[PDB]
């Protein structure tokens, strides 16, 4: 979608330059431990699971559908990290982005 939008220009205006949009992953990438590998240690917190691989095997069914009870536990573990790490960095990013200009987020 970003490529198609960036490939449009009608009256020499070039609507939606790629430089005027920001993905949903820059905020995560800014953190020195980025959010993805940050959440890949929930297996340390969870009891009875020793790896990300067998964590996935435990949480997901043979039909690739998440058991509600297991997912809820994983959500219990996930909510703090999303609440107390990502939020302030996101605040800072949106603040300085707003100060810098108007963009699509």
């Amino acid at each position: 979608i970003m490529r198609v939008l960036d490939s449009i220009s009608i009256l020499g205006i070039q609507i939606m330059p790629r430089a005027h949009v920001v993905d949903s992953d820059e905020v995560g990438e800014q953190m020195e431990p980025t959010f993805e590998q940050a959440v890949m240690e929930i297996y340390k917190g969870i009891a009875g699971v020793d790896s990300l691989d067998d964590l996935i095997k435990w949480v997901l069914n043979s039909d690739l559908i998440p058991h509600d009870d297991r997912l809820g536990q994983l959500f219990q573990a996930f909510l703090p990290l999303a609440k107390d790490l990502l939020a302030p960095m996101a605040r800072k990013f949106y603040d300085n982005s707003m100060s810098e200009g108007r963009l699509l987020t």
């Binding site: 043979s62 039909d63 058991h67 009870d69 297991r70 536990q73």
Partner: protein, 140 residues
């Protein structure tokens, strides 16, 4: 002559005949993978309850807990395990705090020995003290 390692330690022309193609696509209901996972848990052997039995030297194995209270503690473990298996705070099915009055129930423990006495002192220790009371030494 191929050795089998031990489990434990002890002492010391055309081809491709027609009809061999694989084009059928059948989705079993119930699914195969779902059934195998359930049957793996079912075929598990039962736990070893060796508490209260003697050992290599003749000392009764297990902790020193009263016969009555041992049964009640074991009941609490079953309910706690049962809740975990259903991934709930508690389980609907409980082995403890039923309406029944099982005040006389008993379960095996390491508190008593085979002769019917108490294990306040290990059986091996008791033998050593008894046989030492008859020891005689060299004259001066």
């Amino acid at each position: 002559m191929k050795r089998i390692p031990r489990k434990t330690k002890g002492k010391s022309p055309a081809t491709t005949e027609p009809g061999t193609s694989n084009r059928e696509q059948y989705k079993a209901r119930p699914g195969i993978a779902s059934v195998q996972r359930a049957t793996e848990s079912a075929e598990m052997p039962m736990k070893n309850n060796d508490e209260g039995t003697p050992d290599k030297k003749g000392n009764t194995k297990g902790d020193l807990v009263n016969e009555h209270s041992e049964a009640k503690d074991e009941a609490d473990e079953a309910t706690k395990k049962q809740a975990k298996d259903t991934d709930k705070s508690k389980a609907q099915v409980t082995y403890s705090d039923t309406g029944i009055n099982n005040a006389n129930e008993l379960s095996r423990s390491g508190n008593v020995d085979n002769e019917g006495g108490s294990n306040q002192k290990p059986m091996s220790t008791r033998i050593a003290e008894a046989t030492s009371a008859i020891v005689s030494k060299h004259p001066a």
